[PDB]
Design a protein around this ligand. Sequence first.
Ligand SMILES: CC(/C=C/C=C(C)/C=C/[C@@]12O[C@]1(C)C[C@@H](O)CC2(C)C)=C\C=C\C=C(C)\C=C\C=C(C)\C=C\[C@@]12O[C@]1(C)C[C@@H](O)CC2(C)C
Ligand SMILES: CC(/C=C/C=C(C)/C=C/[C@@]12O[C@]1(C)C[C@@H](O)CC2(C)C)=C\C=C\C=C(C)\C=C\C=C(C)\C=C\[C@@]12O[C@]1(C)C[C@@H](O)CC2(C)C
Ligand SMILES: CC1=C[C@H](O)CC(C)(C)[C@H]1/C=C/C(C)=C/C=C/C(C)=C/C=C/C=C(C)/C=C/C=C(C)/C=C/C1=C(C)C[C@H](O)CC1(C)C
Ligand SMILES: N[C@@H](CCC(=O)N[C@@H](CS)C(=O)NCC(=O)O)C(=O)O
Ligand code: SF4
Ligand code: SF4
Ligand SMILES: C[As](C)(=O)[O-]
Ligand SMILES: C[As](C)(=O)[O-]
Ligand SMILES: C[As](C)(=O)[O-]
Lengths: 41, 195, 64, 80, 211, 163
Amino acid sequence: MKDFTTYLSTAPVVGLGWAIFTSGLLIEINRFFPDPLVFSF
Amino acid sequence: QRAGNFAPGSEPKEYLNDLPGNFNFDPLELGKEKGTLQRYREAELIHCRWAMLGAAGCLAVEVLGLGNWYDAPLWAVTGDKPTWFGIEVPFDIATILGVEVVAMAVAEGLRNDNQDMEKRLYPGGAFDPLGFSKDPKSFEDKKLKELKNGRLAMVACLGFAGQHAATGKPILAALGDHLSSPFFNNFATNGVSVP
Amino acid sequence: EIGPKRGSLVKVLRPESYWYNQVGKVVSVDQSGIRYPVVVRFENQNYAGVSTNNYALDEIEEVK
Amino acid sequence: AHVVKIYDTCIGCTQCVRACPLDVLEMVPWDGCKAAQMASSPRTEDCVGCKRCETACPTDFLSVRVYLGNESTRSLGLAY
Amino acid sequence: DRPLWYPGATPPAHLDGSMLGDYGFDPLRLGTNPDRMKWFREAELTNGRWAMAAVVGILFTDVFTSIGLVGLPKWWEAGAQTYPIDNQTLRTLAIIEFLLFGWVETKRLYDLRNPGSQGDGSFLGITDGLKGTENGYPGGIFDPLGYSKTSPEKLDELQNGRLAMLAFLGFASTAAVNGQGPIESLQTHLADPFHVTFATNGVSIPHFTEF
Amino acid sequence: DIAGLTPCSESKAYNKLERKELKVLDKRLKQYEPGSAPYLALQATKERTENRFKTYAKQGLLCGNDGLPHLISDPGLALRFNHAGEVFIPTFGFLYVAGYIGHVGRQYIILSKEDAKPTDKEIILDVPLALKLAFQGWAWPLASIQELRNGSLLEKDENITVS
Ligand SMILES: CC(/C=C/C=C(C)/C=C/[C@@]12O[C@]1(C)C[C@@H](O)CC2(C)C)=C\C=C\C=C(C)\C=C\C=C(C)\C=C\[C@@]12O[C@]1(C)C[C@@H](O)CC2(C)C
Ligand SMILES: CC(/C=C/C=C(C)/C=C/[C@@]12O[C@]1(C)C[C@@H](O)CC2(C)C)=C\C=C\C=C(C)\C=C\C=C(C)\C=C\[C@@]12O[C@]1(C)C[C@@H](O)CC2(C)C
Ligand SMILES: CC1=C[C@H](O)CC(C)(C)[C@H]1/C=C/C(C)=C/C=C/C(C)=C/C=C/C=C(C)/C=C/C=C(C)/C=C/C1=C(C)C[C@H](O)CC1(C)C
Ligand SMILES: N[C@@H](CCC(=O)N[C@@H](CS)C(=O)NCC(=O)O)C(=O)O
Ligand code: SF4
Ligand code: SF4
Ligand SMILES: C[As](C)(=O)[O-]
Ligand SMILES: C[As](C)(=O)[O-]
Ligand SMILES: C[As](C)(=O)[O-]
C-alpha cells in the first residue's frame, strides 16, 4: 500500500490523472456547451 | 531658498538643494548628474522667457481686438500684407524668414559663446540697464518670480494650442464659453480630448 | 590553515568551468602545497558526469 | 599534424594514456599529491585525432585539447 | 485573537499578532510579508468604509420606496435617470470625480508611505490638523467619539464593513439574475420562501427539473 | 461597417452556406427510418447545427464577402462597438490560467530545492504538496506583483554564463 502510493507519483500518475482530468473537463464543456466561438459579450 | 514641495511629505531629492525655484519635483530622477542639470536650467530659463513673450502676445492680440494668434501668419496664404495694429507693415514672406534666420543666427551664436556658467543663465550689464539685479536680496526673489511666472506661461501656451486643436474657438472665446455654462462647456464634452 | 574551512561552501570563478558563480562545498583544501589546492565538490553533474574538481585559491570567493 | 597541448590543469590520473588507442602521450615527472604525474606529447607523427584522450580526461576544464591540423596517411587511418 | 473562522483544528501561521477583526482567516497566505499585510489592511479599510456608505443608499432609500412614501428609482437605473433630467450636470461627472479623488487619494497614499508626514507650511494653515494618529485612522476627521480608552470599537466598523461588502456583492448578483431590487427580492422571498431561491436562478443544473 | 465587413445576418453567402449544409445533411438523413438510432443522431446533429448558426448572430460578429465569421482582435475596434469577446477577454482568461499554472509550478519547484536529492521529487512528485499549491494559486496576480516589489524572484546574478 505504501510502496503503491509512492509508485503513484510518476508518469502513470498526474500526466495520466492530469490530462485525463483536463480532457474530460474540456470534452464535457464542449458537450453541454455545444459550439462556442465567442464570449457572451 | 526652497519654495515648497510638489507633494507634501515627498522624500527630498539631493540634486536640487541649492537651486532656485526648488520644489523637489524631478520624479523620474533626471538631471541627477551635475553636468546635465546646468543645461537643463538654461533650458528652463530660456523656454520660460520665450513662453512668457508668446503668451503675452497671444493674450494682447485678442484683448486689444486685432484677431487670433492662430490666424497670425495666415495672411501669407491669402496674400494680404501683414499688420501690426493695422499699420500694415509692407514686407513680403521671404524677407521676413531671411531676416529672422540671420538675426536669430547672430544672437544665438553670440549667446552660446559666453562660457560663464552663471551668466549663461542670468546675463548682466546691457540686458538689465535699470539695475534691478544690484540688490542681492531682491535679485533672488525676482529670480523665483520669473521662474514661477514663466512656468505658468509655459503651461498656458500649451493650453493655447491644446484648446485650439480640439475646439477651433479662440482663447477669450473659449474662456467666455466656459464661464457661461461651466458644467456643460468642458474638456470632456469636446468629444476629442477624452476618448 | 591555508584555504577556507573544510565543510564551508564556496563559489567558483574559473572562467572556463562548467560550475561558475554557483556554490559548492570544499572536500579538502590541499595543505601539502600545490597550485590547485581547493578541491570543491558539487552534487549536480556536468557534461562529463564528474562531481568534483580542484581549483586555485585566487579564484574561489566567499558565500552568497 | 595534430597540435596537442597539455595545460597545468592536471591531476595525473593516468587515464588519458590507458585510453589513447595510439600510445602517443607520455607521463614523466610532475610534483603532485598522491600520484604526481603530468601528461606530455613528445611525438605526433602517429596521432590520428580521434579525441579519445579528451573523453577520459576528468579535468575541468580539459587538460588536453587536440588542435585539428592537416591530414596524412597516419592521420587518415589508411591501410592503403 | 478573537474566535477562529474554522472552530476546530485550523492553525494560523502569521495571524497570531494583534490586529483589528482578526479571526485567523487567510487560506491563500496573501499577507505573509508584513509590509504587504500593512497595505492590505488599509485596502480593507477603504473598501469597507466605501461599501457601507453605498449599501445604505440602496437599503435605507428603498425601504421607503416599497412602503410607498417616496418614489425614488432603483439603483440599477438611478444612473440612467440622472442625465435625462432637465437640470443635468452631464458626464463631466466622471473626470471631475477623478480629479477631486486623485488630489486626496495621493495625500492618503503619501501618508501611508511616510506616516504622519505633512509639511509645516504646505497647506494653508491646516497642515496641523492633517496629521493622523495611525494609518487609516486620522485625527482631524472625527470630531467627537474618539477620545475613549475602549478604542477597540474598530471591531464594529470592520465587521459592518465586511457585512456591507457582502451586501453590495449580493445586490449586484441579485439585480443581475433576479431582475428586481433587493427589497423587492426580500419581500417576495418572505411571501414564498420555497420558490424564490438562488437554486431557481443562478445555477444551470436544476433547470432540468422535468419530474 | 468596420474593414468593409458587414454584420453576419445580412450576409447572403452565410445563409446560402447554412442552406447548403442543411441540404447536404438531409439528403443522407432521408436514408433511415424515424425510429432507428442513426436517424436520431442526424436529428441531434442538425439541431446543434441550426443552433450554431442562430446563436452566433447575437451582439454582432462581422462576416466578410465570404459569409464566414471574422474575429476582430484589436482593442479599440472591439471597443466603441460590441466585440470585446471576440478576442479581448479570452486573452485575459488565458493570461489568468497561464499565470496560475506558472505560479504553482514555480512555487513547487522552489519549495523542493531545500530537501535532499530534489531530483527525486521531479520524477516522484509530492502529490499532496502539488494539490495544496494547486488550490492556492487563484490569487496569483496579487502575489506576483507584491513578490516582485519584494525582490524574492530576481536572482542577484549568481548563475553560470560564458560570454
Ligand atoms: C510646457 C512645456 C513643456 C513641459 C515639460 C515639462 C513640464 C517636463 C517635466 C518633467 O521634466 C520634469 C521637470 C522632471 C521629469 O523627471 C519629469 C518630466 C514630466 C519629464 C513646453 C512649453 C514651451 C513653450 C514655448 C517654447 C513657447 C513659445 C511660444 C511661441 C514660440 C509662440 C509664437 C507665436 O505665438 C506668437 C508669440 C505670436 C503668434 O501670432 C505666432 C506664434 C508663432 C504662434
Ligand atoms: C466583495 C468584495 C471582495 C471579496 C473578497 C474576497 C471574497 C476575498 C476572500 C479571500 O481573500 C481572503 C479574504 C483571504 C484569502 O487568503 C482567500 C480569499 C478567498 C481570496 C468586494 C466588495 C467591494 C465593494 C465595493 C467597493 C462597493 C462599492 C459600490 C459602489 C461604488 C456602488 C455604487 C452604486 O451602487 C450605488 C451606490 C448606486 C447605484 O445606483 C449606482 C452604483 C454606481 C452602481
Ligand atoms: C467616522 C465618523 C466620525 C464623525 O465625527 C462621527 C460620524 C459622522 C458618526 C462618523 C461617520 C459615521 C458613518 C458615516 C457611519 C456609517 C456607517 C455605515 C454607512 C454603515 C453601513 C452598513 C451597511 C450594512 C452593514 C449593510 C448590510 C446589508 C446586508 C447584510 C444586506 C443583505 C441583503 C442582501 C445581501 C440582498 C437582499 O436582496 C437584501 C438583504 C437581505 C438586505
Ligand atoms: N441597451 C444596451 C444594449 C444591450 C441591451 O441591454 N439590450 C437589451 C434589449 S434592447 C437587453 O438585452 N435587456 C436584457 C434585460 O433587460 O434583462 C446598450 O446601450 O448598448
Ligand atoms: S586524439 Fe586519439 S590518437 Fe591523438 S593523442 Fe588523443 S587519444 Fe591518442
Ligand atoms: S587524462 Fe587529463 S587529467 Fe588525467 S593525467 Fe591525462 S591530462 Fe592529466
Ligand atoms: C481641427 As483643424 C481646422 O485644426 O485641422
Ligand atoms: C505598501 As507597497 C509594498 O504595496 O508600495
Ligand atoms: C446581463 As444584464 C441584467 O446586464 O442585461
